[PDB]
């Protein structure tokens, strides 16, 4: 009476590596067979560009940013609010047998009985007769770590796919190493298709195909350089195929029954997956969920194709931090860089274990990249706007062109409205946010919704003419609210030399602010714009830092200064402070090792 669900998930991979989507992608017979009686989605996206935040999104059908869960990997996992749970929990409570093999990577504390079984080898096979099932399985074959091979492999190990015929992303240098790396990733797609075929063939042999909705997708965009970790479309777009079972076509509009392979162009987001399973299972959506089912009885293909919106979020990835938000609407992609002085290339240990990332940066410093290839390593515009139909690789910023003036304002207002209404908790620094919000993020968000609107208004003053906002900005710099001073300094950093008139106030923040991150921002400004040598002060503030996250924040600032000004830092940490402890220790070790050398 009720449908089964299967989620087949490959790690870290975007759609361009699949022949299903790209003429130069990898042949994948097993996935392509799913597509024969399936919906092939051309515009599926995660809402963030890394595993933990995307998988959190998949599970909850809600934005991690509004739940203090936007940090990979978490310093502290957050407890779920009363009225929101995971799709595996909802289904388990509805009588489904739910199995997960095996990666979770949630940024919340798990519900009790979250899965019937979640471990290596967990399977639908242990369900009682007549009991519907939900099986989720992850393959790590396409994970970023698999591209961390030694550069000598270009000579010593050959690929099955031809690197000489690789057509690279325009932001990439056209090098032997980049073509080779691309080819290596194509090879992994061939391998993971084989592996997924094992599970698909079991379902076939057991006569379950026509009772089961089978989803195949990647768990976020990636994973060549400039993708994973960024809310460019590269970090967000994923393949998505849904094989529609014959016995439950009646749950779907005739348009979507996939009697023949059917392409869908409407924008689907990871927030939509859980509500989709809920509707197919005949269960109600939670009021705290942000997504909307894309498989519904009265929803035509035309109607589904009208959907054209995706909001995306990036904050901390391992030791490296930045704050970026993306807003896609129709053909337009808008990016808001709240901290534009942080280049996307800002050092991250794990990113740069990929030899292509190191070559990319080396070529940048050797002045051998063109302007499209070098944008990754440079100071960012406060806003960028792209026409994805004309410019799918986001190479031409339209925000400074006169005919796009109205569109800039429309996208700007849309994002502001969304982030205010959510509200986006990440306008509170993690070092403050997560410890307070840990027991119930919703309670925190209700109390601080207005405060967050104020933070957003303050930082968005940096979009305006300096003289127009000068007085307002000054009052906030002198505010009694430490996080308002924080966002005011960030706006000042955005303005750069245009805010020189504030030098005395910045100096006082530098010397005397009760908040050490505020001091660090002031120091950062004076180092970037006024020749101040920040090494000693920042080293001192790191040692003085009350807790790990505050220290980590200051180390991120030291990294930005390191990269931009070519200076080394001799870092020593606070005396005052186990897979979690290993992870956290690794962040600091990564930062200390890196900063020691110019």
Ligand X SMILES: O=S(=O)(O)OC[C@H]1O[C@H](O)[C@H](OS(=O)(=O)O)[C@@H](O)[C@H]1O[C@@H]1O[C@H](CO)[C@H](O)[C@H](O)[C@H]1OS(=O)(=O)O
Q: Which residues bind ligand X (CB under 6 A)?
A: 11, 50-52, 73, 103, 105, 140, 143-144, 318, 350
- Residue 119 lies near its own copies (rule: CB under 8 A): yes
Number of residues that bind Cl ion (CB under 5 A): 4
At its nearest, how many Å lie between ligand A1APB and the CB of residue 547?
21
- Residue 234 lies near Cl ion (rule: CB under 5 A): yes
Distance between CA atoms of 335 and 398, rounded to whole angstroms? 11
Distance between CA atoms of 108 and 138, rounded to whole angstroms? 19
Distance between CA atoms of 361 and 152, rounded to whole angstroms? 18
Window 283 to 312, contacts with ligand A1APB (CB under 6 A) = none
At its nearest, how many Å lie between its own copies and the CB of residue 550?
17
Number of residues that bind Ca ion (CB under 5 A): 4
| CA 338 to each of CA 341, 383, 460, 560: distance values in angstroms, whole numbers, following the listed order | 9, 9, 8, 15
Binder of residue 14, out of Cl ion, Ca ion, ligand A1APB, none (CB less than 5 to 8 A by kind)? Cl ion
Q: Which residue from 506, 498, 551 is spatially nearest to 524, judged by alpha carbons?
A: 506
Q: Which residue from 238, 187, 172, 203 is spatially nearest to 10, judged by alpha carbons?
A: 238
- Residue 13 lies near Cl ion (rule: CB under 5 A): no
| CA 383 to each of CA 269, 380, 478, 529: distance values in angstroms, whole numbers, following the listed order | 23, 8, 27, 22
| CA 213 to each of CA 127, 248, 364, 367, 572: distance values in angstroms, whole numbers, following the listed order | 17, 9, 47, 51, 54
Site string for Ca ion, 198-237 (x = CB under 5 A): ---------------------x------------------
Distance between CA atoms of 50 and 73, rounded to whole angstroms? 9
Could you tell me how many residues make up the chain?
Answer: 598
At its nearest, how many Å lie between ligand A1APB and the CB of residue 583?
7
- How many other C-beta atoms are found inside a 10 Å radius of the C-beta of residue 500? 14
- Residue 443 lies near its own copies (rule: CB under 8 A): yes
**Region from 16-24, 34-42, 93-101, 440-448 binding its own copies, contact rule CB under 8 A:** 440-448
- Residue 156 lies near its own copies (rule: CB under 8 A): no
Window 122 to 151, contacts with ligand A1APB (CB under 6 A) = 143-144
User: ∠ CA 418-230-12 to the nearest 5 degrees?
Assistant: 110
Looking at the Cβ atoms of 379 and 438, the one nearer to its own copies is 438
- Residue 322 lies near ligand A1APB (rule: CB under 6 A): no
Looking at the Cβ atoms of 127 and 320, the one nearer to Cl ion is 320
Window 339 to 368, contacts with ligand A1APB (CB under 6 A) = 350
- Residue 11 lies near ligand A1APB (rule: CB under 6 A): yes
Binder of residue 537, out of Ca ion, its own copies, ligand X, none (CB less than 5 to 8 A by kind)? none
Mind giving me the DSSP string for 37-57?
TEEEEEEEE-SSSSHHHHHHH
Number of residues that bind ligand A1APB (CB under 6 A): 11
Window 561 to 590, contacts with its own copies (CB under 8 A) = 578-579
- Residue 109 lies near its own copies (rule: CB under 8 A): yes
Distance between CA atoms of 331 and 388, rounded to whole angstroms? 5
Q: Which listed residue (13, 30, 46, 51) binds ligand A1APB by CB under 6 A?
A: 51
Reported as half-sphere exposure (CB side, CA atoms, 13 A), residue 443 has a value of 11
- Strands, E assignment, 330-442: 332-337, 383-387
**Region from 8-16, 61-69, 108-116, 541-549 binding its own copies, contact rule CB under 8 A:** 108-116
At its nearest, how many Å lie between ligand X and the CB of residue 105?
5
Q: Which residue from 56, 82, 81, 84 is spatially nearest to 70, judged by alpha carbons?
A: 56
Beta bridge partners, 325, equal 313, 336
Looking at the Cβ atoms of 71 and 273, the one nearer to ligand A1APB is 71
Q: Which listed residue (10, 14, 57, 520) binds Cl ion by CB under 5 A?
A: 14
Window 240 to 279, contacts with its own copies (CB under 8 A) = none
- How many other C-beta atoms are found inside a 10 Å radius of the C-beta of residue 348? 19
Binder of residue 350, out of Ca ion, ligand A1APB, Cl ion, none (CB less than 5 to 8 A by kind)? ligand A1APB
**Region from 106-114, 211-219, 344-352, 458-466 binding its own copies, contact rule CB under 8 A:** 106-114
Question: Helix or strand or coil: residue 326?
Answer: strand
**Region from 134-142, 387-395, 444-452, 509-517 binding its own copies, contact rule CB under 8 A:** 444-452
Q: Encoding tokens for residue 215?
A: 């989803």
Q: Encoding tokens for residue 380?
A: 């960012």
Looking at the Cβ atoms of 172 and 454, the one nearer to its own copies is 454
Contact (Cβ atoms closer than 8 angstroms) between residue 136 and residue 150:
no
Q: CB-based burial of residue 593 (10 Å sphere; 0-12 exposed, 13-18 middle, 19+ buried)?
A: exposed
Distance between CA atoms of 226 and 222, rounded to whole angstroms? 8
Number of residues that bind its own copies (CB under 8 A): 21
| CA 89 to each of CA 103, 132, 217, 303: distance values in angstroms, whole numbers, following the listed order | 16, 14, 21, 30
Q: Which listed residue (4, 10, 48, 51) binds Ca ion by CB under 5 A?
A: 51
**Region from 11-19, 74-82, 119-127, 374-382 binding Ca ion, contact rule CB under 5 A:** 11-19
Question: Which residues here bind Ca ion, judged by CB under 5 A?
Answer: 11-12, 51, 219
Question: Which residues here bind its own copies, judged by CB under 8 A?
Answer: 76-77, 79, 82, 109-112, 119, 287, 435, 438-440, 443, 446-447, 450-451, 578-579
């Amino acid at each position: 009476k009720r449908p089964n669900f299967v989620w087949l998930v490959s790690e870290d991979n975007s759609k361009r590596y699949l022949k299903l989507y790209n003429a130069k992608g990898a042949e994948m017979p097993n996935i392509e067979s799913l597509a024969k009686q399936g919906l092939v989605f051309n515009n599926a996206f995660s809402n963030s560009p890394v595993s933990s935040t995307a998988r959190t999104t998949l599970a909850l059908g809600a934005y991690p940013a509004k739940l203090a869960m936007e940090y990979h990997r978490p310093f502290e996992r957050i407890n779920l609010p009363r009225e929101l749970s995971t799709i595996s929990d909802y289904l388990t409570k509805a009588g489904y047998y739910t199995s997960n093999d095996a990666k979770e990577d949630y940024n919340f504390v798990s519900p009790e009985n979250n899965w019937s079984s979640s471990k290596k080898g967990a399977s639908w096979h242990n369900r009682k007769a007549g009991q519907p099932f939900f099986h989720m399985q992850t393959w790590k074959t396409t994970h970023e770590g698999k591209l961390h091979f030694p550069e000598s492999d270009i000579e010593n190990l050959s690929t099955i796919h031809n690197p000489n015929s690789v057509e690279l992303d325009p932001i990439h240098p056209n090098t032997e190493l980049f073509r080779y790396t691309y080819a290596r990733y194509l090879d992994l797609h061939k391998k993971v298709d084989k592996e997924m075929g094992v599970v698909i063939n079991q379902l076939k042999e057991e006569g379950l195909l026509e009772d089961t909705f089978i989803f195949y997708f990647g768990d976020h965009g990636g994973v060549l350089p400039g993708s994973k970790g960024f809310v460019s479309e590269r970090g967000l777009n994923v393949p998505l195929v849904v094989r529609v079972p014959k016995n439950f076509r009646h749950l779907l509009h005739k348009d979507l029954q996939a009697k023949l392979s059917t392409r869908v162009d409407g924008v689907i987001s990871f927030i939509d997956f859980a509500p989709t399973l809920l509707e197919l299972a005949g269960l109600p959506k939670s009021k705290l969920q942000d997504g909307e089912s894309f498989l519904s009885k009265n929803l035509s293909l035309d109607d589904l194709n009208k959907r054209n919106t995706n909001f995306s979020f990036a904050d901390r990835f391992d030791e490296k931090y930045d704050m970026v938000r993306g807003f896609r609407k129709g053909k337009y992609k808008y990016i808001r860089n709240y901290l534009p002085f942080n280049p996307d290339g800002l050092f991250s240990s794990y990113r740069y274990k990929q030899a292509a990332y190191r070559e990319w940066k080396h070529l940048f410093k050797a002045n051998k990249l063109n302007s499209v290839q070098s944008a990754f390593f440079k100071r960012k515009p406060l806003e960028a706007l792209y026409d994805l139909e004309q410019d799918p690789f986001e190479t031409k910023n339209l925000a400074l062109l006169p005919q796009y003036t109205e569109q800039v304002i429309k996208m700007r207002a849309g994002l502001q409205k969304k982030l205010q209404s959510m509200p986006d908790l990440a306008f509170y620094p993690e070092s403050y946010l997560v410890d307070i919000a840990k027991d119930d993020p919703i309670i925190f968000s209700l109390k601080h919704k207005n405060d967050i609107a104020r933070f957003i208004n303050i930082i968005d003053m940096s979009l305006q003419p300096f003289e127009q906002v000068k007085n307002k900005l000054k009052a906030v710099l002198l505010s009694n609210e430490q996080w308002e001073r924080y966002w005011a300094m960030n706006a000042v950093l955005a303005f750069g030399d245009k805010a020189n008139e504030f030098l005395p106030i910045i100096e006082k923040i530098r010397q005397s602010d009760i908040n050490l991150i505020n001091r660090s921002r002031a120091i950062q400004y004076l180092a970037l714009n006024n020749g101040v040598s920040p090494q000693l002060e920042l080293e001192d503030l790191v040692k003085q830092a009350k807790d790990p996250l505050t220290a980590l924040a200051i180390l991120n600032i030291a990294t930005q200064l390191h990269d931009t000004l070519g200076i080394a830092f001799n870092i020593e940490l606070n005396k005052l402070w186990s897979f979690h402890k290993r992870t956290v220790d690794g962040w600091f070790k990564a930062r200390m090792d890196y900063l020691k050398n110019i």
